[PDB]
Amino acid sequence: MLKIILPSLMLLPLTWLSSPKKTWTNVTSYSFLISLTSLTLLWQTDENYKNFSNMFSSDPLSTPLIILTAWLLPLMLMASQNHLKKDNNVLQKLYISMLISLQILLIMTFSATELIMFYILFEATLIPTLIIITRWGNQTERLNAGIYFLFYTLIGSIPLLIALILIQNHVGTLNLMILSFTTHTLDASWSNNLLWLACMMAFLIKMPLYGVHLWLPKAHVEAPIAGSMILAAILLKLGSYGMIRISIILDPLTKYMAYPFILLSLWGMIMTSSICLRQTDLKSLIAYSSVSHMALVIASIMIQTPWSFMGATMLMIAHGLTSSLLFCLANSNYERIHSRTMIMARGLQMVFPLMATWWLMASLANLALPPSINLMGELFITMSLFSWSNFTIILMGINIIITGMYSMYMIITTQRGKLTNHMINLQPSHTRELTLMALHMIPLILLTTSPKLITGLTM
Amino acid sequence: VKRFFESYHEVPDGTQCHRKTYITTALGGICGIIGSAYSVSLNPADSTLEAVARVGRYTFTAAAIGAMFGLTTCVSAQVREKPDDPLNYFIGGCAGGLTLGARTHSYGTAAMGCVYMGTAAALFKIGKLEGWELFPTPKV
Amino acid sequence: MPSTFFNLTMAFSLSLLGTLMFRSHLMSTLLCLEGMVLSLFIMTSVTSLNSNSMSSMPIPITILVFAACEAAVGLALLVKVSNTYGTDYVQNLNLLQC
Amino acid sequence: IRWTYARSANIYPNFRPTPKNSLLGAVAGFGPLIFWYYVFKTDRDRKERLIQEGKLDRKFNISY
Amino acid sequence: PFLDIQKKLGISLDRHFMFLSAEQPYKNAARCHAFEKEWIECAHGIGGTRAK
Amino acid sequence: LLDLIWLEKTIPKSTSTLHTNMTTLTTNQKGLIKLYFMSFLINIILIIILYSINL
Amino acid sequence: DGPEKNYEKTLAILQIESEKAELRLKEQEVRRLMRARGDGPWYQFPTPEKEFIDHSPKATPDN
Amino acid sequence: MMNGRPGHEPLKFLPDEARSLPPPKLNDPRLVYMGLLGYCTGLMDNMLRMRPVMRAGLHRQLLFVTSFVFAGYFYLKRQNYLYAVKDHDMFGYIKLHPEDFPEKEKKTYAEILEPFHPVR
Amino acid sequence: MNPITLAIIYFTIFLGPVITMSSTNLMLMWVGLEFSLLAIIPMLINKKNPRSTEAATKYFVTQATASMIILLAIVLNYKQLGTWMFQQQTNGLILNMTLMALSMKLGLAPFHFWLPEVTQGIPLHMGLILLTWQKIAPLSILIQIYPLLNSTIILMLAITSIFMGAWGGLNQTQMRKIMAYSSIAHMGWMLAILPYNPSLTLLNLMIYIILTAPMFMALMLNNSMTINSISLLWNKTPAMLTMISLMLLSLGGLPPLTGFLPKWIIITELMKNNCLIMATLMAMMALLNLFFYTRLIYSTSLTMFPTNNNSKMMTHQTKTKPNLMFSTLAIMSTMTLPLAPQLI
Amino acid sequence: QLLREHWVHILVPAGFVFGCYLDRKDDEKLTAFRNKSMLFQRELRPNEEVTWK
């Protein structure tokens, strides 16, 4: 893992020592090459998971996320190349440094072996993301959005710290292999239930549960494009990954401590998907779509069947890529019309015919088009939940209908219809934007070709 | 003596209601008097009769919260068959919060206090069953 | 010894109480502090004489010396506050509330 | 612009709790959760009862 | 003491008048000299927790 | 009704309120040594009482 | 490299991370016992010093 | 906790007893990080005083890095000594009191009836 | 002040605490306390403005009362055990009063109302001494008697001060008062962990000092003393913003920064000792600190506040004030977690 | 010379090289059980030193 971490660190010296002219090109290129290097973690020809040292490890669950993180950084730089067009060189380099630091910390987090590695490297992500939202955001309420994002997560996390310390005192260690191979059954004492909650709540907040999902619609419509991309591609999955790694010890309490959160997920999914129908902000609509998908992920993880885990992982990756693409597209139209309303710009298929194609493909990934890995994930989660209780199909079906509905609503409202001819400023699509969308789609298509890579530990 | 306060847990809840209500009322009154002494020592009032009215109001309010809490907790534990179930202390703490809201003439305090005081009481009961220890002594 | 120590402890307690509750004039508070100093010195003196510990009789004098030094500092501060406000009233010492 | 502002940032500032609002919010939030709770709990408890006794036959459930 | 400057340097600024059993002017031992000496010699070596 | 109003009131804004109420309750001190030392006296008494009752 | 490298390295990881755990719990036990019984190198609180006692013949025989 | 350990010598940085431990390797990650901290401190000083961040004050930067490494070496040595002392006292005490730290005998997994909780 | 007064006064301020920590005798520790008390006051009242005089008087009265209470404790311990040091057999009330009076000296809640006022009144270069160097002696006096302290009293004071400092920080706009409240909170942590393992109390003291001194010198740089005033550093001195942000966040106690290590290690010890409720509450309430530090960070570094026409001449003129110690302490305080094992 | 600024291109590949070396060191330290595991333990072939080095 240290053949992937160190190049990432060295990106920073490159960013700061490069000449002002070539800095963007150099960092983008070397970040792509770091992404290439990260593929070495897919040479798992045996069931023995990789453990590169006492500190860093990898698994079938961590390799896809690490590779996704590596892949995102070049795309984040391309997406940020524009709105930073007229800032001073040091400020541009600061932005690039923030993104590089975010990648470093996230890779280390996903590759951490001890949960008190994880608890530090997980919260260290707050600083770069908070800076990205607050400093380079546009509208005034970005400060409030930053405050929400910081403190929701910190309130969630502190109880996680307490629980982890108790765990270490009780067990003697926090290496996840050791916890897995020496776990023991919890008893249904009230203190154990309180623990279960303390361990699970920070991750559930980062996987915004229906009742604690108010920090996404704000953080996203106040954050720049790169912030939104990294956030709702990787940060949101920190919660799922933590939950998956930590639930091993917290058994058998889950059987009855999951009813509340399963119910909240399976209801908030419908509520948020419906909210997407009548929202006048494209960024917000995408954010609430993300909330619904993470609701599904949470339900599956909290039922813990092999299908649940594998489908949850698949959908984690699929949502990463798809939501990222959607946000880049919306930012594309925003960079021109300088507004976030969906109603304002319409019929843009009459002037951006190809970007309309990318819009269509993204909407299909969102609505879950077979055989796309997005569908595969949702289908397998549905099978798991139906096994868990055969009545969940009602909620699942209502959500499927509404998902298709807002997914096509975006397209019809924006791409189709009479062109708002008064928009003189609409300019031909930049090769940068088109290449960004292509780099988002092509990995999705290749993984749909080869799903075996993105299955979880179970399958 | 501290015997009076430690007698609260002589017999599980649902029994000796009147005694437990007395004990919680006394504890609430003591807390109220302490708070009133602080609130008069700082932020003085114009009249000494105003100060004594303030101490009376604080003391009576705190005593009322404590009395309602004890009464409702014991009544719940008695009417339902669960003596040591923290939901009872939660309902009692909610009753205390609602009484505070009434005393202050505000529904927002009623709701916030219900949630917070009920959680505090439930956690207290859970601690007493599970053996938690506040203010421990160095064991290392 | 026992009754004497009880009364002396009560005296120090009363002087501490007087210091803690003010009454306008800062000079009176300084005097109350000075009275606590007196009581503490007497306590130490009687304890040493009772125990026949002549190696601890150097210490009451140090108490007096340092208490005198702090009392002098207090008087100088009184002079400065008086120059500022025209009186020694402690009510005037309220600017830093903001 | 005015329409979006009115449907976004003017809401909570121009919100006041009322009896009707409190009841409607509390029901529309919690009540559906309670309903689905009872549904799933009864279904899964019946399933567990049958599975325990052995009445339920899991003919070819291999993947669960 | 928090920092043992005196033990480090070998000096005794204030360690010689700590208890009633220390040297007194003109060899006038304080009240309970024998008792204090016994207690302190008993309590040397063993820690305070064991001495108690 | 729920997402933009009740959830915000219940979780974020209730906490924000309560903490602002408590800071405005505590911080605003008239700034007089007489009252401050009266409070110190109450601390004196409370520590004495705790010591006595706990024995 | 091949499966052996990963498998046996993992064995070494487990060895180290189990011994560390047992030693940490053992540290808890030992410190508890030393604090509670004062019989060990640690938690040896100080007592006054005998060296500065005065043993010379005093001016009163019965001292 | 370790202050009263028998044989403690007051205010001695490295007691002579410490020479028996393997001394730090001078390319240790800790000392390298110390050097990095010193270099960054030099750069920060330049930036604050409004100087060429990397070009100016090379003597200052060299002094900073060398001073950080120099202090780090000795501090690391003392820390190694202290942890080694802790382990020594640990194991000595445990050996002395076998009664209060009995060695557990572990039953194999066959004989242990671990409850099974279906995940249905 | 003439040079000879500077020498003598500064030397006495330095002497007092050294006497306290190198004295085996309680009366000599009290002598060190009195040395610090007497010598600081002239530095406080050096300005001779109406606010300065009142701040000095408040300090004087409070500290004198604390010293007398401590002296009573010493004298009664003498009456009981014929000695000048606290022993295991010493009466419990004596130790209670000592803890209470040293708490008043340190500024801990509920004896905390005096510290904010004095810090607001006095200038920054003396505020640094007040909030750093003057705490070493009292905390040393406690640490020398740590095995005998009262867990209930100490935890009560500590949690009280955490809550009070956190709540007080929000309302204040003044940097001087904000730093006073931060001092209160960090001392709350220090005393919370004192009875269990004083090594971590000293670790927290070190890290708090190493974080506060840089911040105080940062304020001294432009004599900033208000949120609005510090908001103008993006114009007056842009370079410092990065490290100011990092340092405020560290003091708040975010994981990657060093500030985590004190709180994390202290929570770990308390949990080892089964102090779960107090540990949880303290950790929870230590987040208001992050809030009222994040407001500062927003005001200074992440947003650019309105500036004035006359700042252009401040730009024109040269600056030579930041020290080497600023850079050293700031980096070594906000970039040292990876060396944490060596610290504890 | 254009090395003036093309020297910067050696940082990242140096990062990769250095990381690989450090990985080798990390595997060096974890040598025990080199050939002492139930599944894979074998007698070394003639003319051999280390199983996985």
Ligand SMILES: CCCCCCCCCCCCO[C@@H]1O[C@H](CO)[C@@H](O[C@H]2O[C@H](CO)[C@@H](O)[C@H](O)[C@H]2O)[C@H](O)[C@H]1O
């Ligand atoms: C289960 C635990 C997890 C849940 C944790 C929830 C903690 C969340 C804390 C969020 C605090 C943010 O605090 C936020 O402060 C801003 C100040 O700009 C307030 O902002 C608002 O305040 C008031 C409304 O009351 C208006 O007059 C003002 O104009 C407006 O900006 C927000 O209403 C408040 O929400």
Ligand SMILES: CCCCCCCCCCCCO[C@@H]1O[C@H](CO)[C@@H](O[C@H]2O[C@H](CO)[C@@H](O)[C@H](O)[C@H]2O)[C@H](O)[C@H]1O
């Ligand atoms: C369990 C502990 C959890 C702690 C974590 C949560 C942190 C809470 C942060 C509390 C502070 C938030 O600070 C928030 O500030 C805003 C303004 O900025 C206040 O809001 C204010 O807005 C304007 C003035 O600005 C007024 O019209 C309004 O009446 C007033 O309330 C909020 O009422 C306060 O809550």
